[PDB]
Design a protein around this ligand. Structure first.
Ligand SMILES: Nc1ccn([C@@H]2O[C@H](COP(=O)(O)CP(=O)(O)OP(=O)(O)O)[C@@H](O)[C@H]2O)c(=O)n1
Ligand SMILES: [Mg+2]
Ligand SMILES: [Zn+2]
Ligand SMILES: [Zn+2]
Ligand SMILES: [Zn+2]
Lengths: 133, 43, 196, 773, 65, 49, 114, 180, 264, 160
RNA sequence: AUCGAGAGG
């Protein structure tokens, strides 16, 4: 139930694909050339300016029927400002000594490429994405 | 009532098709459907 | 049906409170689908809605005469002067929810014609009923309490389905079933029969 | 013809029809008065005696009453008028004629009976209004649109008849069409447009909406999906709620245009375990087309689950649409001024080109063209100019239209409309066509009196530059009237001709039926086909599948399908198979691998002879892509782990499956050979998708998975075989008949006149021809 | 045939206004829409009933029996 | 408003359609099919007064 | 002809209960109530006030057919909380809110002069 | 109408004749009638064969001498580029029959739909005559509250449809509500 | 004033009242509208028996008009539903009986008006059944014009009713609804060719709410608490009373649900 | 015409090919003339193909052109239905037609034949011929009212 | 019953 992957990215570009609410985000790992990320995000819920650096985190947990947060006795998983849940569609090997990770948060799509980890982000449908300001 | 009062029958070599000569003399579009289209028109 | 060739039966009858309402409170008398319009390609229905709205707010008649140079932009300019949206679209709220509608709805006055076809004069059902003498078969037509014809094209549909017994039931037991006595040696119904 | 083959039938009903979204597709809404009039006989049973007594007490006037009661002596008892109606005492063996009630089998029909789909059984639901009520998705097999449509209902009078209607003629069974091998019924109209709009990523649902929409699903588990977006607010994806609608265990992959796994366009569909991973639902996704979600759900889950799926999707999408709303107005038709000026420029350029070509004809400078009159060439060039002009104006309009335009939304969803409609509304409608030609001079050397004599310019010729929105000139309106009139005469005449053709085909092929030997034979017993369809398989189960062997280079085929045990690189990598390190350099295994490779090479040559075009995609009995996907999801498949599969078992089990698959059970060698020929192409496909390298690398298969795949292929193929007693000929005739009515319209006889020539085996064709290579 | 009591969309009574409306047009020589605004019908639901109406009754009155 | 033009026979209003007929006393040349002994014909339908 | 009488919308029939309560299968602390001879008006309000209550996990209303005037409400609550009590508190809150609004409007109208 | 020479070639009918015709309408001064114009020679009757010899113009303004900036929405009207016009049509809309005359803006719509409506206007309910209550028809249907159409063809006044309407100007919304 | 919903009234007339509902859930506002027109009771004729008809108009048409005729319903609470009393066809408490007779005495046309209506049933000191006249002339709504030599004589029975059953028992014609005038909540997306602001009109209700600023983000959490409403009256019941009666009707339905739960 | 042919690599590649189209057909002199592939030549007319080559070739051409008619409208039909019709015309060896001088002239039961056309003529010839109906045909049983063998009537159902 | 006319998808 522990956190799997954490990294810092500076967004390379933001592109609205005929959508006012959602723009796709292109970014690369900071201080690592191993990995890069490409994920769509609703800008209205959380606006990301281009060239901003935003923390990225993935956790397995912290299905059971969703309940309203209500009192919040359950400890907030994230101090982060943005979180999404999704299921990985496929995992592929982009190149020798290189892995690729494909996630789908309700049709919204995330792509992570790197060899930085040899094993992580197993094909478990559970995923949580945490982005700080 | 008026349209029935102004009626044409063409009993029976392409009668059904509207013809250029009909301009100014016959309604372009008023015709019964079925096996009467163009055969019967209104002035 | 409207004068522009759009024809439609009443799917449902709805009370005013259920109907979507504009901010003014005006409720459409009738609802027509967007989908029917594109294939038929009758722009003049839309144009009539626009011009009739301008006329209703203007107190003057509208001329839809053919081959007359009337610009849609000008009619929309007059509608804008009235304050209603130029293209005829209007802000609407869903009736049951009371929520605003994400898509503004195009609604306005439109001439519509009641037609001679009436449902209750068309409704018919037979069950067991009177029979014609010679055919020994059900009479024809609602006016005579008649029975609907099972077409040979319909029997072909049934053969495609392969329901032989249902075909027999419609063909004999629902129709001129009859019992006859035949002599084997004649091979014909020459036998005279005193059943009791 | 009219009192024996077709006759008036008792227990008949007919009304005007209308559609109800909430009514389930298999059901038909029957007005209560019709139920009161119609009766079904029911022998009194100990099970039904209480219900029957109560029903007779209710009386004929109110349903579930009854009309007549029949004794053991059988003398009629009339409930409307009887002194003894109160004292009614049911005795065993007596019959009770009773009102038609909810969930009773009937037959529902539209008067054109082009297809067996037009006459099919329906569940009954009694309703208090004059119109028959039916689902929107059931319109297409009937071809019914509720402008003034009238439909007929018939009621069985015997238990065997009830069973025949329920077991073979029910709507769920006829979901997938025999002809065209694609489902008949699909999501249409408002549900289509709303399903596209909801599936858009921009569309985000809210907790109140998601709760109501989840409740709206009748079979809903109550399991609340986790919100796609949580921390800023809990917002569910529209895709997520629609996924709540999808039955679990269904997987669908469609790639269109640039359908990347990232799918930026959101084109194509990715569905896993009853949840759409990505894509926007559209017509191809949810329509009648082959490979549609209807087809897969009917084929794997079953017919009833898919029948409920229509209704669940319908309810969810209709509720969301009602709350979102939809419209269509004049502004959708209006295009921007700069685009309008570009349209006018296009028309002007076409006019200049036409004038210059006309001058070329006048000067006799224009080059002669072999095989045609020079005036004929002129006509072709001007017609093509005008047609291209209209298409280009439509292109500029389509670029001009914004994403918000509702006609665009109808086209994008595929619910209704086309490119031509948009062009005609906001661009040049174009040149009219009369009798396959541009407008002729009815007046001497002039099309119309107002034009000057001997004018061949497009306006006189009937080319209608103005848009429908722009308004048509009087001359243009008259020309358009000529074209429309020709269209109406054509519709009437072709309906008559198609009726005659369909009757003749039906009468010719009516007797044709598959007997128990699988030999297609007439009444006399003279064989028409020794194996029906030459494969002996039901056409509904056949779906388009690709044949991997026929396509691709020899090098690519070798790399994908060849593993050479006696090589450093060609041998299977040890990660693919744990015994691979042991298996390396074993001749006894390589001999079997070589045998399978020889079989695949022979199959490639055989298929390449059959297909000169080399098109891999063909109708095939059992889909194997979906079955491999079902294997991956049924048994969780890990890429990292080496497989536990003996190579020997893979090859030997493909062979074993080959002799297990059976079309004809006879022991005799003639029947065995007919079977081997019948199953030949299916065997080639099976070998193509069961290759040892393919089984080891592209899918990380296991022994239990492979055994299940073998058994499931066997079972699906067994289900795919035709059933004896089927009337193949009638179905064939109807299958040809229905598309013929739909047909509507440089010298080729085509369409219904051509079909009439083909059936008449007429000595003289209107346009004979020889194509020499 | 005769002035409708109420508009089917609007719902407001419209029968009372008609006599006054015809008088307003004839005596004041004024535009119909201005007369409708003076009458108080400001919504086209309420307005269509007054503008479109045909008083067939008067012709029906002419027949002696 | 009734424009008239309908006969009243046995209490029923009855109206007469006009029948289109090609005019008499007009001569026209008509081509003959390929399987015809004669290439062209010229036909005149003469109408009495 | 076949059309049912208008009074059927607001009048209960013979052997008809305004509320019928049946627990939802395959769900915890969940129950579905068939409100009979009632329309959207009441259902949406009941849903909103139910949503305001924190302990009520699920609330939704559905109309099976526009023909027939009835609506089905499903409620899921926290353990130890009966759905009927939640419905009672939400309805009581509705009544108090309507009363407060009528008093405030009456005072405002008394202030209003025309 | 008749077009002859006068130094611009101009239609025979002139404004003063129109004023006398209007005065005849007002008194309903010496009567000015259509029979007068036919006897005056201002207008002529033309059979189909006679048309084959003549040259006609749709619009009277076409005759005015030709010698830019225009609104895009106006339909593309070909510059007539023609002379020696024998006559000019009174109005194009006259080619339409009675049933087609009732259709509004058919110039902006597809012709087959206009044909269908011309078929439907017969079926449409209406007040058939003012004498209906006195008359004894086998079957008769009459609207409760007939309403004049908001959009009127200029031919409607001669058609008397405004006087005897057959439809209602109902408020119509184009939307998908509840899927019915 | 009290905790809970508040109403501020911008303007008010005897026929119309324009106010601002505040601090309210929207579902309550829509339930209130549907009660305000649908559910509130009102008195109108449900039976008509005509002795003489010489009018060209048929009796059924006149009966429909008489149903739509507006009558006072202020004391309607004292009156009882015709099905809810114990009478045969009409209790004197449950129904009000009206009579109308007119003859074409004048050679010129004689026009029936709503003022020419005769009440026979006992009034019982209840402000009920008086014909409603808003005309400046005071002449009632025109049922029918009658030429000389024509007479009509008829009896009407008016009963308590609800607007859902038939439109005649309806207090109000239409209501004006407005929320999110600036479209800050963005509940609806404008359809525009070039600019939404120019093509879509700006309402007067927009001014009351504070103007939006482009810089501030869209408030996801925000929900509508302020609504703008106007009410129109036929005059059968005064406006303040129609809105208060709608509130009371809704509260009655809620109390009925509570009592049914208690019965269970 | 664009032709997809195997490359030496084995890939199907498209290289244009000249083709000839004629307005008329004699087809016996044409195939013998040199410079043209006898194997690839095609005719729009079946009957000439049946005379020139053989009945099975004519059946294939029949299906080809029916398929062209279906494809021109965008409609698709499974090969079995069209093939079945073509075999029914083909099984006699002659190019039997879907018309009165077709299936009706065949040796099938007269009562089946009488339904289509020439009812009383089929009957008078059968009466002169003393022809006996097998009553196997579906139309025969439908007229007779006895249950035809249609799947359901094909099998007799006996108890154990 | 016959004959005929008009209409509907
Ligand atoms: N004589 C006739 C005339 C009509 N019909 C049937 O009525 C349907 C309605 O379409 P329709 O008549 O309007 C022709 P369509 O091409 O479908 O245009 P649309 O989109 O406006 O519906 C047709 O599809 C036919 O099946 C028939 O069976 N015999
Ligand atoms: Mg239809
Ligand atoms: Zn004998
Ligand atoms: Zn109104
Ligand atoms: Zn009483």
């Amino acid at each position: 139930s522990n956190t799997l992957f954490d990294d810092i990215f500076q967004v390379s570009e933001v592109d609205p694909g005929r959508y006012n609410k959602v723009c796709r985000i292109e970014a690369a790992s900071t201080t690592q050339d191993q990995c890069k990320l490409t994920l769509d995000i609703n800008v209205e819920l959380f606006p990301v300016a281009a060239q901003d650096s935003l923390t990225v985190t993935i956790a397995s947990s912290l299905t059971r029927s969703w309940r309203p947060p209500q009192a919040g006795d359950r400890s907030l998983a994230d101090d982060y400002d943005y979180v999404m849940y999704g299921t990985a569609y496929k995992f592929e090997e982009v190149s020798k000594d290189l892995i690729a990770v494909y996630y789908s948060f309700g049709g919204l799509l995330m792509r992570l490429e790197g060899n930085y980890r040899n094993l992580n982000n197993l094909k478990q449908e559970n995923a949580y994405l945490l982005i700080r300001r | 009532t008026l349209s029935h009062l102004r009626r044409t029958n063409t009993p029976i070599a392409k009668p059904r098709q509207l013809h250029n000569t009909h301009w100014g003399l016959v309604c372009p579009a008023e015709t019964p459907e079925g096996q009467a289209c163009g055969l019967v028109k209104n002035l | 049906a409207s004068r522009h060739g759009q024809k439609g039966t009443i799917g449902i009858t709805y009370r005013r409170e259920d109907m979507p309402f504009t901010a003014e409170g005006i409720v459409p008398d009738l609802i027509i689908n967007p989908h029917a319009i594109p294939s038929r390609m009758t722009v003049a229905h839309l144009i009539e809605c626009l011009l009739s709205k301008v006329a209703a707010l203007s107190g003057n008649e509208g001329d839809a005469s053919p081959f007359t140079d009337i610009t849609v932009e000008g009619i929309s300019k007059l509608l804008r002067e009235h304050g209603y949206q130029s293209r005829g679209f209007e802000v609407m709220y869903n009736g049951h929810t009371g929520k605003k509608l994400m898509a503004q709805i195009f609604f306005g006055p439109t001439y519509y014609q009641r037609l001679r076809h009436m449902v209750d004069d068309k409704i018919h059902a037979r069950a067991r009923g009177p029979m014609q003498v010679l055919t020994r078969q059900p009479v024809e037509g609602r006016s005579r309490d008649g029975g609907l014809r099972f077409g040979e094209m319909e029997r072909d549909c049934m053969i495609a389905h392969g329901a032989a017994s249902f075909l027999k039931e419609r063909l004999m037991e629902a129709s001129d079933a009859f019992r006859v006595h035949i002599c084997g040696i004649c091979g014909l119904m020459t036998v005279i029969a005193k059943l009791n | 013809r009219g009192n024996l083959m077709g006759k008036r039938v008792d227990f008949s009903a007919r009304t005007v029809i209308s559609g109800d979204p909430n009514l389930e597709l298999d059901q038909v809404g029957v007005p209560k008065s019709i139920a009161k009039t119609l009766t079904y006989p029911e022998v009194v049973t100990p099970y039904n005696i209480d219900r029957l007594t109560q029903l007779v007490r209710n009386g004929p006037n109110e349903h579930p009453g009854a009309k007549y009661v029949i004794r053991d002596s059988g003398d009629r008892i009339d409930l409307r008028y009887s002194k003894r109606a109160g004292d009614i005492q049911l005795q065993y063996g007596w019959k009770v004629e009773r009102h038609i009630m909810d969930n009773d089998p009937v037959l529902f029909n539209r008067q054109p009976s082009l297809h067996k789909m037009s006459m099919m059984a329906h569940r009954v639901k009694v309703i208090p209004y004059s119109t028959f009520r039916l689902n929107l998705s059931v319109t297409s097999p009937y071809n019914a649109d509720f402008d003034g449509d009238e439909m007929n209902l018939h009621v069985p009078q015997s238990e065997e008849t009830r069973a025949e209607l329920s077991q073979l003629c029910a709507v769920p069974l006829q979901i997938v069409s025999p002809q065209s091998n694609k489902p008949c019924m699909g999501i249409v109209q408002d549900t289509l447009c709303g399903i596209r709009k909801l599936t858009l990523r921009d569309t985000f649902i809210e907790l109140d909406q998601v709760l109501n929409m989840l409740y709206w699903v009748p079979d809903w588990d109550g399991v609340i999906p986790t919100p796609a977006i949580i921390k800023p607010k809990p917002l569910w994806s529209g895709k997520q709620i629609l996924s709540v609608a999808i039955p679990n265990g269904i997987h669908l992959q469609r790639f269109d245009e640039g359908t990347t796994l990232l799918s930026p366009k959101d084109n194509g569909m990715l569905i896993i375990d009853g949840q759409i991973i990505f894509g926007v639902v559209e017509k191809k996704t949810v329509g009648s087309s082959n490979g549609g979600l209807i087809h897969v759900v009917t084929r794997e889950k079953g017919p009833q689950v898919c029948a409920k799926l229509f209704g669940n999707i319908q309810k969810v999408v209709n509720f969301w649409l009602l709350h979102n709303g939809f419209s269509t107005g004049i502004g959708d038709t209006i295009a921007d001024g700069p685009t309008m000026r570009e349209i006018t420029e296009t028309i002007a350029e076409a006019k200049k080109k036409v004038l210059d070509v006309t001058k070329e004809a006048q000067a006799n400078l224009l080059t002669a063209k072999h095989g045609m009159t020079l005036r004929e060439s002129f006509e072709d060039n001007v017609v093509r100019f005008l047609n291209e002009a209209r298409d280009k104006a439509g292109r500029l309009a389509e670029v001009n239209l914004k994403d918000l335009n509702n006609v665009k939304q109808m086209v994008m969803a595929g619910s209704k409309g086309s490119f031509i409609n948009i062009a005609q509304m906001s661009a040049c409608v174009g040149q009219q066509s009369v009798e396959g030609k541009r407008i002729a001079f009815g007046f001497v050397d002039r099309t119309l009196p107002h034009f000057s004599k001997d004018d061949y310019s497009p306006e006189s010729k009937g080319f209608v530059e103005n848009s429908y929105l722009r308004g048509l000139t009087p001359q243009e309106f008259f020309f358009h009237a000529m074209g429309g009139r020709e269209g109406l005469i054509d519709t009437a005449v072709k309906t008559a001709e198609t009726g005659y053709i369909q009757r003749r085909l039906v009468k010719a092929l009516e007797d044709i039926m598959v007997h128990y030997d699988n030999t297609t034979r007439n009444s006399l017993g003279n064989v028409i086909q020794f194996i029906y369809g030459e494969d002996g398989m039901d056409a509904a189960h056949i779906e388009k599948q690709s044949l991997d062997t026929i396509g691709g280079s020899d090098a690519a085929f070798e790399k994908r399908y060849r593993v050479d045990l006696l090589n450093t690189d060609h041998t299977l990598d040890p990660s693919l198979l744990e015994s691979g390190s042991e298996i390396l350099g074993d001749l006894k295994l390589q001999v079997l691998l070589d045998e399978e490779y020889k079989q695949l090479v022979k199959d490639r040559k055989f298929l390449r002879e059959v297909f000169v075009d080399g098109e891999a995609n063909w109708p095939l009995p059992v889909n194997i892509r979906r079955i491999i996907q079902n294997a991956q999801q049924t048994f969780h498949i890990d890429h990292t782990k080496p497989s536990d599969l003996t190579i020997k078992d893979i090859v030997l089990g493909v062979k074993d499956l080959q002799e297990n698959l059976l079309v004809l059970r006879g022991k005799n060698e003639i029947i065995q050979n007919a079977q081997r020929d019948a199953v030949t192409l299916f065997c080639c496909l099976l070998r193509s998708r069961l290759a040892t390298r393919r089984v080891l690398q592209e899918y990380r298969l296991t022994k239990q998975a492979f055994d299940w795949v073998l058994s499931n292929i066997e079972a699906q193929f067994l289900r795919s075989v035709v059933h004896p007693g089927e009337m193949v000929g009638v179905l064939a005739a109807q299958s040809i008949g229905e598309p013929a009515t739909q047909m509507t319209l440089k010298k080729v006889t085509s369409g219904v006149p051509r079909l009439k020539e083909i059936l008449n085996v007429a000595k003289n064709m209107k346009t004979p021809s020889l194509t020499v290579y | 045939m005769i002035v409708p009591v109420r508009c089917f969309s609007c719902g407001k009574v419209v029968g009372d206004k008609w006599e006054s409306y015809l008088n307003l047009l004839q005596e004041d020589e004024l535009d119909e829409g201005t007369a409708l605004s003076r009458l108080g019908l400001k919504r086209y639901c309420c307005r269509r009933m007054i503008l479109t109406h045909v008083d067939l009754i008067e012709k029906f009155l002419r027949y002696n029996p | 408003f009734d424009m008239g033009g309908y006969f009243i026979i046995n209490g029923s209003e009855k109206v007469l359609i006009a029948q289109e007929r090609s005019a008499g006393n007009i001569v026209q040349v008509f081509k003959k099919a390929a399987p015809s002994p004669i290439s062209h014909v010229a036909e005149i339908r003469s109408a009495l007064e | 002809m076949n059309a049912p009488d208008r009074f059927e919308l607001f009048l209960l029939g013979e052997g008809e209960s305004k509320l019928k309560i049946d627990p939802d299968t395959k769900a915890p602390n969940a129950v579905v109530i068939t409100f009979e001879k009632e329309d959207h008006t009441l259902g949406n309000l009941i849903r909103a006030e139910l949503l305001n209550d924190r302990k009520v996990l699920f609330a939704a209303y559905k109309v099976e057919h526009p023909f027939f005037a009835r609506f089905k409400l499903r409620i899921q609550t926290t353990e130890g909380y009966d759905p009927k009590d939640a419905l009672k508190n939400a309805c009581n809150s509705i009544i108090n809110k309507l009363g407060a609004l009528k008093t405030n409007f009456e005072t405002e109208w008394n202030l209003q002069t025309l | 109408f008749i077009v002859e020479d006068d130094g611009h070639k101009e239609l025979k009918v002139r404004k003063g004749h129109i004023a006398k015709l209007m005065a005849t309408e007002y008194q309903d001064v010496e009567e000015y009638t259509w029979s007068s114009l036919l006897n005056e020679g201002l207008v002529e009757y033309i059979d189909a064969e006679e048309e084959e010899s003549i040259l006609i113009a749709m619009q009277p303004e076409d005759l005015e001498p030709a010698e830019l900036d225009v609104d895009p929405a106006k339909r593309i009207r070909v510059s007539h580029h023609a002379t020696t016009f024998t006559h000019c049509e009174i109005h194009p809309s006259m080619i339409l029959g009675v049933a087609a005359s009732i259709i509004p803006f058919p110039d902006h719509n597809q012709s087959p739909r206009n044909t269908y409506q011309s078929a439907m206007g017969k079926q449409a309910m209406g007040v058939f005559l003012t004498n209906y209550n006195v008359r004894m028809d086998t079957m008769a249907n009459i609207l409760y509250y007939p309403q004049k159409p908001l959009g009127t063809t200029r031919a409607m006044e001669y058609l008397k449809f405004r006087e005897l309407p057959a439809g209602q100007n109902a408020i119509v919304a184009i939307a998908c509500y509840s899927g019915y | 004033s009290e905790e809970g919903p508040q109403v501020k009234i911008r303007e008010a007339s005897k026929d119309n009242v324009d106010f601002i509902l505040s601090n309210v859930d929207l579902a309550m506002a829509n339930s209130l509208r549907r009660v305000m027109i649908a559910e509130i009771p009102t008195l109108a004729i449900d039976s008509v028996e005509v002795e003489t008809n010489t009018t060209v108009l048929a009796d059924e048409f006149i009966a429909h008009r008489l149903g739509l005729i507006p009558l006072q319903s202020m004391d309607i609470e004292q009156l009882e539903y015709s099905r809810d009393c114990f009478c045969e066809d009409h209790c004197d408490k449950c129904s009000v009986v009206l009579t109308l007779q007119a003859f074409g005495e004048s050679e010129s046309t004689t026009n029936v008006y709503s003022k020419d209506l005769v009440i026979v049933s006992n009034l019982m000191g209840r402000n009920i059944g008086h014909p409603i006249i808003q005309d400046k002339e005071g002449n009632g709504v025109l049922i029918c014009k009658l030429r000389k030599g024509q007479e009509l004589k008829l009896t009407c029975v008016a009963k308590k009713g609800i607007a859902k059953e038939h439109a005649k028992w309806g207090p109000a014609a239409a209501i004006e609804f407005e929320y999110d005038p600036w479209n800050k909540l963005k509940h609806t997306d404008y359809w525009y060719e070039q600019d939404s602001a120019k093509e879509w009109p700006q309402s007067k209700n927009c001014e009351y709410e504070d103007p939006p600023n482009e810089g501030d983000p869209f408030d996801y959490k925000a929900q509508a608490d302020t609504f703008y409403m106007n009410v129109e009256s036929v005059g059968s019941i005064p406006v303040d009373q129609v809105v208060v009666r709608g509130i009371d009707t809704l509260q009655k339905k809620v109390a009925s649900i509570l009592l049914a739960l208690t019965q269970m | 015409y664009d032709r997809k042919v195997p490359s030496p690599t084995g890939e199907y590649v498209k290289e244009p090919e000249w083709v000839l189209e004629t307005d008329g057909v004699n087809l016996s002199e044409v195939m013998t003339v040199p410079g043209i592939d006898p194997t690839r030549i095609y005719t729009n007319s079946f009957i000439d193909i049946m005379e020139v080559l053989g009945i099975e070739a004519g059946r294939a051409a029949l299906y080809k052109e029916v398929y062209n008619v279906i494809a021109s409208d965008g409609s698709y039909v499974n090969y079995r239905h069209m093939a079945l019709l073509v075999d029914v015309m083909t099984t006699q060896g002659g190019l039997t037609s879907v018309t009165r001088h077709g299936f009706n002239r065949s040796n099938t039961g007269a009562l089946m034949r009488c339904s289509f056309e020439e009812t009383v003529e089929i009957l008078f010839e059968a009466g002169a011929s003393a022809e006996l109906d097998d009553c196997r045909g579906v139309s025969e049983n439908v007229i007779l009212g006895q249950m035809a063998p249609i799947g359901t009537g094909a099998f007799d159902v006996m108890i154990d």
